[model samples]
Target: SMSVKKPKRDDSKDLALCSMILTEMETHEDAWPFLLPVNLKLVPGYKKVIKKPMDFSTIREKLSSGQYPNLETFALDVRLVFDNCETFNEDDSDIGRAGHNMRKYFEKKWTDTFK
Candidate 1:
């Protein structure tokens, strides 16, 4: 009998991508306010975590340790940050435009980084 083979999971690439995004978030002051709500929503009880910009350390540890079973959860949560920001700000406002731009770049980066 023939059996199908499953692809082995390699989280290195995902970890790299996450690291890059976290580094950018840390440096990009403009994106902080936008990420705040996401932090709150994703980790409500942990105010200390929410206090940080995207909770870089905790997220980094989780991703590096492969705590997330798959990349989709991390990707979706990151996307949520941008989506929430885009929705919260007025379309004509600078913050809204920044969110839009960030989202576009993020999508492109994910596509390029992932298979």
Candidate 2:
């Protein structure tokens, strides 16, 4: 048996913070649209336009499974979720408004938590 020494604090602490922010976002009222991968059949054109789709469930999976290589990398993935929102939908649309709120909350939450 071996206890591995992790790098740059070994992702344990920062990953925890990432998880914390994710949970808060999950519970956010506007999180529904971003909670899971969009259904391709229901939203067929999504694949053609939004090349890099992202959602909370996927982020949660990566955070727990060690896919994120760094703190900002994790945050970058979350930001992409919003970027995709902006890419396809108008700012006044339902999902777009939700993405905006989620993004605003994420920026503030990540800043304070990481600080």
Candidate 3:
């Protein structure tokens, strides 16, 4: 007889914002309506990824269904949206700054939950 192993507990700290929302929404009904919109202008290459808005519905389905190996994997998957992105201007690229702001938001939220 083979014994099935259980998965580890979810630690949201390491998870990307989108990944965390997708995961929590699976088990908790109130996790929706959290992601703020980023005004992305279609520039090229890295910008295109940010331009296309994330499909939260699809993300929720895949994450809840265990399509991803782990939260960190999912987090990295989301980070791929900003892969190879370099700052265009001195301090005001919309997508770049938006991504940074969203990251800061999630970081704060993650810490606040633990406190």
Q: Which one is best on lDDT? A: 2
lDDT of 2: 0.87
| Cα lDDT tens digits for candidate 2, 27-51 | 9988999999988778968988888
Rank candidates by lDDT, best first: 2, 1, 3
> Model 1 has how many clashing residue pairs?
0
TM-score of 1: 0.61
Which of candidates 1 and 3 is the stronger one according to lDDT?
A: 1
Question: What residue pairs are clashing in model 1?
Answer: none
lDDT (C-alpha, whole model) for all candidates: 0.63, 0.87, 0.47
Q: Residue pairs in steric clash, candidate 2?
A: none
Kindly report which residue stretches of model 3 are placed more than 4 angstroms away from their true locations once superposed.
Answer: 1-58, 83-90, 111-115
Q: What residue pairs clash in candidate 3, if any at all?
A: none
Reference-based lDDT, residue 7, model 3 = 82
Cα lDDT tens digits for candidate 3, 71-91: 555655444333323323223
Quote each prediction's TM-score.
Answer: 0.61, 0.86, 0.41
